[PDB]
């Protein structure tokens, strides 16, 4: 009469099993078990969903999954209750749904356990008050896959006939590419502008060196545009008398960032560790399944009181009172990506390759740092007057490292009083040129997608990978480049699928899927509205170019 517990991977099973008594029998589904394969029976067949028949779906068991199916049913009868312990997100919710449909039986036999980490306490609480499968979330998850399937299978064929065979269309992927093609064109059309800067080396009364940057000439910002203007300014600066007009000494602080969420974890892992989005999410996943960190698909910077209290204890013991804030820091109930146990160091992780330990370390330090006091600096700003010019010297000295103490080990302005005379040693004119917009990176793109409300913790990685192996954009030197085909398709889609390509409408769809997940909308009605708009767009696109249809990629003579 033992209880059955189902998870989606052997790894999770392994870990969760350590915290489940003998009353439980943990089993992995090993994959999704089941999923998908003016109406056209053949189109509907390929899609596995019927837009013209109220979104009737045809879910099939994946290859070689019937064995696992019969393995679960068999274990299901022997169990008095079935616990679907899939991941906490919608996809996890849908997988749980599919397992229940297959294994069949009374709904009362099923509980949906949710937990953001696989630890003794988290599993305890998760299995103490088991919840029910949330059909709204399942519907929100299926609504998403149905529309993605629709766009994919209905827009792609049009692309094959108008542009090229094999091209793919993606509800969100095409919008993502659009961001890259837009950036590509801003860069292409950028005309670098020349501007100059003049730095001045001076000596304080006490003989110390003081590097100054000219900021103003005649109270207006100093922005010479060419060599002649710079020379004229330089010959004036060469004869001027330098003196400190203002000495601004102010205490400043730097606060630690918020604990990681999916998008910032990917950004930081990419910038600091050079890790790609896929690599990061793959390692993050293994760390989560091994019970080392909380769920890695989140956009919440929340930290549980237990997590906060465990880290504050670590900070007090290992860093001291001055690094412990009066009260815990709170940022912006899911959780941030943090270690499951702060006392587990990156070096102590079992069966994790070097890079996964490094990701853990990144996550660990960010988590610890986020609960530490601010770093304190004594900032100094010197405003120097030189005839009609004003020069600036900015300095900074660390007064208290605070949170930076958990980060790896790492300009001193000389002492000058206002009114002091400075001696000019040398003037250095430097030619600069405005730089075109930076190219999207592994990080900055997810960030841009997060910013525009387009992505989603559990889609960022997928979106980034999907737009790459299909000839639209390519990553070179850890940077995105839009391919000719990416621009060609993006122009076609913007012209004939404007609503589908619109950033706001795309962000709004995410809101609409969230409305479904929160019982504020009904999935089929949301799918109907989407399909209505979609088909209207699609019908015009299929027409001849002279009818306002999509332009073929021909270059007629
Ligand atoms: C994995 C996955 C998650 N999700 C999400 C988005 C939501 O932020 C998250 C859980 O949100 P919820 O608590 O509002 O239901 O699940 C999808 O929409 N599709 C997916 O494939
Ligand atoms: C300036 C900037 C850099 N980055 C990144 C991406 C890379 O991780 C890193 C640049 O390093 P890289 O040249 O070695 O690739 O910083 C962003 O993600 N956004 C930005 O706005």
| Residue whose CA is at the smallest distance from ligand 1 atom 4 | 90
CATH of the domain at 337: 1.10.290.10
Q: Are 144 and 269 members of one domain?
A: no
What is the residue range of 361's domain?
A: 256-373
Q: Are 317 and 267 members of one domain?
A: yes
Given 389, 410, 436, which residue is the final one in a domain? 436
Q: Are 18 and 85 members of one domain?
A: yes
91 lines ligand 1 (CB under 6 A): yes
Per the CB < 8 A criterion, the answer to whether 336 and 258 are in contact is: yes
Residue 350 lies in a domain: yes
Q: Are 380 and 232 members of one domain?
A: yes
Active site residues: 295
Rounded-to-integer distance, Cα 295 and Cα 118, Å: 9
Residue 323 lies in a domain: yes
SS (H, E, C) 305-368: HHHHHHHHHHHHHHCCHHHCCCCCCCCCCCCCECECCCCCCHHHCCCCCHHHHHHHHHHHHHHH
Residue position matching structure tokens 């699609």:
538
Residue 533 lies in a domain: yes
Q: Are 245 and 380 members of one domain?
A: yes
Q: Is 197 annotated as a binding residue?
A: no
Q: Which of 478, 479, 480, 481 to mutate to test the pocket of ligand 2 (most atoms within 8 A of CB)?
A: 478
- Of 422, 359, 412, 417, residue with least CA distance to 385: 422
- Of 475, 515, 319, residue with least CA distance to 406: 319
Rounded-to-integer distance, Cα 284 and Cα 304, Å: 20
5 lines ligand 1 (CB under 6 A): no
Q: How do strand 242-254 and strand 473-475 relate by DSSP bridges?
A: unpaired
Q: Which of 140, 148, 300, 465 to mutate to test the pocket of ligand 1 (most atoms within 8 A of CB)?
A: 140
Both tokens assigned to 89: 């997100």
Residue 557 lies in a domain: no
Q: Are 161 and 287 members of one domain?
A: no
Q: Is 87 annotated as a binding residue?
A: yes
Rounded-to-integer distance, Cα 408 and Cα 346, Å: 14
Residue 556 lies in a domain: no
CATH of the domain at 179: 1.10.460.10
Number of domains the chain contains? 4
Q: Are 3 and 87 members of one domain?
A: yes
- Of 456, 464, 442, 468, residue with least CA distance to 506: 456
H helix or E strand, kind and range, residue 426: strand 421-433
Rounded-to-integer distance, Cα 212 and Cα 201, Å: 6
Residue 512 lies in a domain: yes
Rounded-to-integer distance, Cα 162 and Cα 158, Å: 6
Q: Are 200 and 287 members of one domain?
A: no
Given 404, 436, 468, which residue is the final one in a domain? 436
Given 419, 436, 453, which residue is the final one in a domain? 436
Cross-strand pairs, 251: 378
Contacts 24+ apart (CB under 8 A), 409-417: 413/210, 413/380, 413/382, 414/204, 414/206, 414/208, 414/209, 414/210, 415/204, 415/206, 415/208, 416/204, 416/205, 416/210, 416/244, 416/247, 416/382, 417/244, 417/247
DSSP per-residue string spanning 405-420: GGSPP---PPP--TT-
- Sign of the dihedral through C-alpha 347, 353, 355, 359: negative
Q: Are 230 and 304 members of one domain?
A: no
- Sign of the dihedral through C-alpha 17, 22, 28, 29: negative
Q: Are 448 and 431 members of one domain?
A: no
CATH of the domain at 55: 3.40.50.140
Q: Which ligand is nearest to the CA of 435?
A: 2
- Of 94, 148, 463, 91, residue with least CA distance to 295: 91
139 lines ligand 1 (CB under 6 A): no
Residue 555 lies in a domain: no
Q: How far is CA 324 from the centre of its chain?
A: 29
How far is the CA of 245 from the CAs of 392, 417, 421, in angstroms? 10, 9, 10
By what technique were these coordinates determined? Answer: X-ray
Q: How do strand 209-217 and strand 220-221 relate by DSSP bridges?
A: antiparallel
Geometric angle at alpha carbon 113, from 109 and 116, rounded to 5°: 170
Q: Are 11 and 97 members of one domain?
A: yes
Q: Are 109 and 26 members of one domain?
A: yes
Resolution in A: 2.3
Q: Residue 456 CA: which ligand 1 atom is closest? A: 6
Residue 12 lies in a domain: yes
Buried b (16+ CB within 10 A) or exposed e, 28-50: bbbebbbbeeeeeeebbeebbbb
Pocket of ligand 2 (CB under 6 A): 267, 270-271, 438, 441, 443-444, 478
SS (H, E, C) 129-149: CCECCCHHHHHHHHHHHHHHH
Q: How do strand 3-7 and strand 82-84 relate by DSSP bridges?
A: parallel
Geometric angle at alpha carbon 312, from 306 and 318, rounded to 5°: 135
CATH of the domain at 378: 2.70.20.10
């Amino acid at each position: 009469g033992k209880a059955l517990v189902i998870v989606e991977s052997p790894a999770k099973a392994k870990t969760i099993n350590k915290y489940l008594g003998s009353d439980y029998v943990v089993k992995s589904s090993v994959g999704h078990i089941r999923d998908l394969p003016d109406e056209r029976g053949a189109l509907v067949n390929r899609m596995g969903v019927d837009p013209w028949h109220n979104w009737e779906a045809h879910y099939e068991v994946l290859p070689g999954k019937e064995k696992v199916v019969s393995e679960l049913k068999q274990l299901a009868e022997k169990a008095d209750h079935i616990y679907l312990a899939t991941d906490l997100d919608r996809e996890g919710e849908a997988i749980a749904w599919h397992l229940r449909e297959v294994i069949g039986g009374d709904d009362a036999r099923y509980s949906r356990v949710v937990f953001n980490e696989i630890t003794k306490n988290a599993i305890r609480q998760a299995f103490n008050k088991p919840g029910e499968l949330n059909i709204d979330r399942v519907n929100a998850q299926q609504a998403r896959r149905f529309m993605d399937r629709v766009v994919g299978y209905m827009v792609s064929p049009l692309l094959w006939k108008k542009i090229a065979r094999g091209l793919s269309a993606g509800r969100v992927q095409s919008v993502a590419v659009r961001l890259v093609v837009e950036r590509e064109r801003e860069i292409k059309a950028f005309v670098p502008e020349e501007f100059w800067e003049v730095d001045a080396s001076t000596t304080t009364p006490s003989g110390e060196a003081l590097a100054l940057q000219v900021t103003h000439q005649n109270d207006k910002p100093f922005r010479p545009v060419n060599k002649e203007q710079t020379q004229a300014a330089v010959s004036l600066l060469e004869k001027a008398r330098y003196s400190v007009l203002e000495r601004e000494d102010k205490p400043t602080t730097s606060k630690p960032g918020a604990p990681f969420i999916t998008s910032t974890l990917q950004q930081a892992a990419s910038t600091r560790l050079g890790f790609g989005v896929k690599k990061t999410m793959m390692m993050a996943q293994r760390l989560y399944e091994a019970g080392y960190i909380t769920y890695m698909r989140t956009d919440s910077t929340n930290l549980s009181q237990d997590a906060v209290n465990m880290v504050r204890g670590y900070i007090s013991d290992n860093f001291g009172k001055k690094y412990l804030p009066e009260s815990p820091n709170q940022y912006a109930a899911h959780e941030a990506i943090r270690p499951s146990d702060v006392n587990v160091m990156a070096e102590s992780l079992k069966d994790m390759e070097a890079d996964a330990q490094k990701l853990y370390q990144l996550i660990w330090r960010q988590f610890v740092a986020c609960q530490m006091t601010p770093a304190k600096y004594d900032s100094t700003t010197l405003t120097v007057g030189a005839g009609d010019f004003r020069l600036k010297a900015r300095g900074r000295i660390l007064r208290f490292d605070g949170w930076t103490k958990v980060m790896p080990a790492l300009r001193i302005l000389p002492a000058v009083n206002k009114g002091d005379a400075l001696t000019l040693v040398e003037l250095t004119p430097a030619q600069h040129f405005t730089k075109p917009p930076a190219r999207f990176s592994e990080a900055s793109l997810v960030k841009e997608l997060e910013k525009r409300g387009i992505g989603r913790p559990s889609t960022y990685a997928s979106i980034i990978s999907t737009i790459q192996d299909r000839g639209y954009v390519r990553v070179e030197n850890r940077r995105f480049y839009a391919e000719k085909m990416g621009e060609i398709v993006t122009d076609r889609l913007e012209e004939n699928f404007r609503e589908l390509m619109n950033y706001d409408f795309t962000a709004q769809m995410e809101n609409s899927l969230d409305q479904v997940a929160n019982h504020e909308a009904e999935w089929k009605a949301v799918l109907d509205h989407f399909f209505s708009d979609f088909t209207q767009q699609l019908d015009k696109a299929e027409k001849d170019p002279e009818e306002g249809g999509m332009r073929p990629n021909q270059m007629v003579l």
